[PDB]
Amino acid sequence: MEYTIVVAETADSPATLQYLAPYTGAALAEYFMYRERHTLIIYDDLSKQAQAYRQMSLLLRRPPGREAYPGDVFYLHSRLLERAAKLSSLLGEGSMTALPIVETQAGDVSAYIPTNVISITDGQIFLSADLFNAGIRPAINVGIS
């Protein structure tokens, strides 16, 4: 608990709060990484954040796009995933490694939100339900990871 600062809003929370919550997590992580220290942020789950933002946009009546998600969502996720880097000793070489948990649906990696967050990260980490029900725990498929 000293190592973490758990940020927890749940599915009861309005989709706006679930939208801005990982932004606040990234903000305090920016303060802590910014103060010379390494830090690690666990977005969990980023697909739920995409659903929350999509709901917020439709209640904003903004016309959604791909897979009925707004086109804004790529820049949106770019915000809270591009604030996560390792600085240099110009500013104190703090580092903000990130594990944005993103749940793909049925292995459809060619769905909009998963291919979007793959298009912003530094690579994939697989987890197949087949290897999970195949006794291999954890179920990281290293051939594509």
Add this chain to the structure above:
Amino acid sequence: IRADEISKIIRERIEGYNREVKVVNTGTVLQVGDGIARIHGLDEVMAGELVEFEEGTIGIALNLESNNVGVVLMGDGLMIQEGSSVKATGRIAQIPVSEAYLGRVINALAKPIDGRGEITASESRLIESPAPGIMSRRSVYEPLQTGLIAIDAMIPVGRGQRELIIGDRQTGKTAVATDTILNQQGQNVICVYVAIGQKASSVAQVVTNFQERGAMEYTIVVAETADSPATLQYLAPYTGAALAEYFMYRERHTLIIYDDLSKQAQAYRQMSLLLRRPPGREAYPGDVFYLHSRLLERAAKLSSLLGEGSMTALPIVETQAGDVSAYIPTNVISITDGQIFLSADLFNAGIRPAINVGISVSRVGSAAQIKAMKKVAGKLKLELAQFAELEAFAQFASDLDKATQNQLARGQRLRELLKQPQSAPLTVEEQVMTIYTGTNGYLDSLELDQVRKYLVELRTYVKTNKPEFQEIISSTKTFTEEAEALLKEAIQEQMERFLLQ
């Protein structure tokens, strides 16, 4: 030459000017946003008038409300002051036309984008001149040639018939379009390669190929930069259509190549969407059907009462992932005279051109091609359809019947006849030669993969030995026993020559 002579023409142009009493409709422009100009005032403006701005970037008035008028920017008006006196021109999108266009890369506002110099022109042809009448026109009874073997053979084009080249991208569609242009070298066929919404480097490449082939002496390329405003980018096929009407209305049969039409539909979609005209299905406006109808129906064959010319059309339509169930390749197949497909499978599988007759079709038929080839191989289209099915069926090849074995090897060698090299436009007599070589089963016993060599040897042998065949049949258009005898004779001789060896 500087400050020496043109002052007399200056005085000629000044003295003798109009000083007109022309009352004009003039509009104070209210709302310009992103290529459109919703203009305040401007009451008596005809929908379709060019509307002259402050700049000179004129514009068509498509929509018009009780308060505003939906006006597009043919030529993007990058600086237009609010409240500018934007008056119309009165006339309706007229197009100057002349035979001196024959070679000049021309822009959709009739402007030479060739670098060859401005064109004198007399008439002012409308942009929405309707189709010629129902009773006034004759059936497509007269042949028109491709230079490509398979389309001529199975799915013919006729002068006036509007065949629709279609297929996925990067499969030689523009290539076969230019090939069937520069086939026309002595057939008195004006070609209008209307290039729409692609690389100007590509249109420079095709006009380079035309300059190399010599075919740019008579053809008129209407280029469209992809940077052009989408109003111009959809307007240009109508300009090409009216320009071909200029030559068809004399007596002169002509050909047109829209290239492509899907970019026309997309640019028109963009203009209709910015005009806030509500979209139909697939997010398109509904009336891309109406747009392409007005386009392609302006392309037909005249009759003897008005000049018996023709405007055979080839609108290439781009479809993604080999689909037909996309909206614009669903409209144009309904409003074309049959369609030919360029499958990626058949292209990259060697059949170049890649017109699989299983899906490709010409819906006016052999009356639009020559009687000699008719009497030779009218049946060969359905024979190759059955061969395509049976060769799909010959996947289960364990104990094939001898009759279907002869059938599959026959249609196999036929399909190998329907392969032809890059830009080798065969004489139509030579197409009659190879199609009789196929339909008379001489090649049946021969080598199955050396049929291309057999054919080039045979065509060189007849074009040397008996060229009198070609002239007598091209003067009679009829497969007679003399043609038969000359054919089987050179067939025996060159079959000997290629047996040994």
Add this chain to the structure above:
Amino acid sequence: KNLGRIAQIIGPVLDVAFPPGKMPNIYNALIVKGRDTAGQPMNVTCEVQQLLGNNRVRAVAMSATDGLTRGMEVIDTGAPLSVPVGGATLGRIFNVLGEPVDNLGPVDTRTTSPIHRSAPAFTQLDTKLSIFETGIKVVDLLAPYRRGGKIGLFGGAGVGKTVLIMELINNIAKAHGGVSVFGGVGERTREGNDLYMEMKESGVINEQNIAESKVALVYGQMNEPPGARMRVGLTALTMAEYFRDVNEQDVLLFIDNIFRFVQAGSEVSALLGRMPSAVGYQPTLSTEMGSLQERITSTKEGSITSIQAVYVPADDLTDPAPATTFAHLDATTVLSRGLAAKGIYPAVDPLDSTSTMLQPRIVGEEHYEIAQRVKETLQRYKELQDIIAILGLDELSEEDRLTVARARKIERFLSQPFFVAEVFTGSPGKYVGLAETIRGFQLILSGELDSLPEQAFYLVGNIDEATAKAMNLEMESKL
């Protein structure tokens, strides 16, 4: 007065205003006139569907939007549009508004029926069910038409529907001594021109002397506005209506295409301030097809037999316009891209195509067993062909291996040539009699002619000619 202004023109939708003294009813023809681009006295006719308040009304125009400018006069005829109908209105090709577009002398315009009328109730409908033979093999076998019913050509992406219309018109126009009428509803103009040429050729129009032509040509262009195409089917229907009540003869309709009508209605309804619907169309599709297929009904006064082509987009059935068109059809023939790809024509899917007049007691209880047996082995073949394409016919066991080859012969045998399609095929076609059809099929389905090669059944009119072609094929197998 009734002279009003046109406030908004957006596409072929015309927002007409009017003074509060007069605001006319729906469906009424308005004619802006006297003006064009050349200062011509060019008129444009425009009817009304929605009237959007303040004594003003949004109209649809049956001619092109060019010419007329906002703030122009309008002359409503105080009535709905009326089409010139009569025996004088046979022969000549004429417009949706009725103007003779044959460019010679106009027909005598003295009997004009209103284009929008009531549909006949079923107390007036002739409930008499009847059988029709049209000479094309697979149709008179498996989809036998009603002489009096409604007949649909569910066509694919331009495959065999219009050439089938030409063939069937050629075969039955001389047969039916009563009147006939071809409705060109958004048809391709040069193919309608080819049809008109065939009517001039076969003398059904009798070019040298007219008004004895029992057929009547009316056409509306693809290039015409959707305001024109939204009512040209109504024009043809009203000509047939006049011949069905006033003339009350045997009347034959050949409208093509009804989906063009649907698309024009959808097209203009998107513009005239109305929401879309499910894929393709307007929300008024069901009522449009209701007006049509309730007005084309064989009446107790006079019979009618309206045949019609249905081009489904994307070549399917879940499409909503054929989802209601099947519901409004009674003799449905469904063409197939697959059977066109194998060249079999008419490329009908006989699994899909059926008819209400395929009852055993109404076709003959042996004809019905013929039809059921061929549909059985054919459907089983279409069921089997996928497993064939992965495991081999020669593997696929014998009690179905005879049936696959049998039905494979069957479909190509019921591909039969047409007297007009000879330009596309090579051999002049054949008018086949249904007794010859059931005879040849009683040979094949029984398995008497299982010795014949399959391509001996290819594109053949008679089973006797099939045996003759079989002997010819055996002769060429030796030679």
Add this chain to the structure above:
Amino acid sequence: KKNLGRIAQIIGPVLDVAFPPGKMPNIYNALIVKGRDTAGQPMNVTCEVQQLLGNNRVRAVAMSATDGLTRGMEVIDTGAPLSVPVGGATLGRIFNVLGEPVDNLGPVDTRTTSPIHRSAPAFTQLDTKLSIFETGIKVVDLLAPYRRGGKIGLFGGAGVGKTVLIMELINNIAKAHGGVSVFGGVGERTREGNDLYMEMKESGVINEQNIAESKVALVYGQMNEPPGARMRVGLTALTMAEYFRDVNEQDVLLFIDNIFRFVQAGSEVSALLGRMPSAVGYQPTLSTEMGSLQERITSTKEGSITSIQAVYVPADDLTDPAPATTFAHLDATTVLSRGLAAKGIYPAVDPLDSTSTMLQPRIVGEEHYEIAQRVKETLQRYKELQDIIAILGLDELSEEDRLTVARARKIERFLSQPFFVAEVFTGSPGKYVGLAETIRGFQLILSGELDSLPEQAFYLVGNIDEATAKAMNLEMES
């Protein structure tokens, strides 16, 4: 100097600015907004007009973060379109969307500047020569020759190897031919932008001291940027490239990646502009903006602007319009199929759609033309046999079809080009091959010289003699 006034509305990134009724600014020109901030009132809020929207009011797009400013701020019309520093001042400098050097170096000299966009170059100012240069990646050099001066399209989804392929291509042609070599980053992972920046620093093509000897203008635009910024960085990079092809008159290398993010920025700004949507999500004007950004890339009469552009195909949809405009707008389509990367070949390039018009006999030699043919025939046949071999197993084929499948997989795993920059990613130090190998490895495969060595015996090795040595090693280890 020009019209001062007040912004009337701000809607997130997009802003609506009113003005004096006399003179409104141009369309497409820029203007800054002073606004406010925490400390000081900087001119960081640069802006750019999009739509004059009635009532002496323009609806405009921003370029920076749009927080802190309000309506009624002191807007400053600069009148002209957005100027940007050009020239040798660009060389090596990692500058940003408005041209300012964000490389923590000096503010570059404004003595030579240019507006952000211009007209399309001329019908005559297009070149004539169908130029071709190789790269070193054998699949490209076999079946997708690269129209230099034309447009070179990199397709594919995410995680299919596109920026890695761009890094390898720039790793070759940074010290290979070509003069000044402008990279542009449109929507780039900024850590990977600085990664390739450090790769250019270490490889020394850019210059640490005396930076004006670099022949590289890495004008990135980071993916974090606002939508107007991503909507303009492509025009900045193209302005640099056209400036060099007109003033340096140079064969300019135009690595850009990836312009799908550019048109996605266009879509997300149109959705707040209130322009009605289009196909599945995007702006209605995607065709015209892609037409701008492509038609302003040409090989001039003196500058063969060779552009290596990438397109992020969203969720591997070739039907999507963001591909469906670009691979009309370019010459060398190179689609990177994901399933090949799932199998494990790097780069993961199918042959069937990855193509060019440069694959032409009268350009590459009829020999190389038929070489690429005899590849493509076999591999297309392998696909049309693949979709029915995966069901129901291998040996249901003929002997010929089995041998053809073996040889097609030979070509496939033989095209596994080991990459010189991928050593730090996988471990294998990459290799370089050329045209002699391009003909000869094909020749051995299609003749049947290499016809018994297994599928690993040409796996991840470019040179066919290297494949023979690898075969010798694996046969030795038994």
Add this chain to the structure above:
Amino acid sequence: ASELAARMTAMSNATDNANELKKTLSINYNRARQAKITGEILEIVAGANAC
């Protein structure tokens, strides 16, 4: 015996290959149907609410 054992393992791999190919095609169908009808719904509500 060896013939109908080789046939038996041919079917024992073909059944499983057909099953996994069916699984991939079912996922493809679900994604395609989802995408098509979402595009349909989004388009028609765009046209409906565009007034």
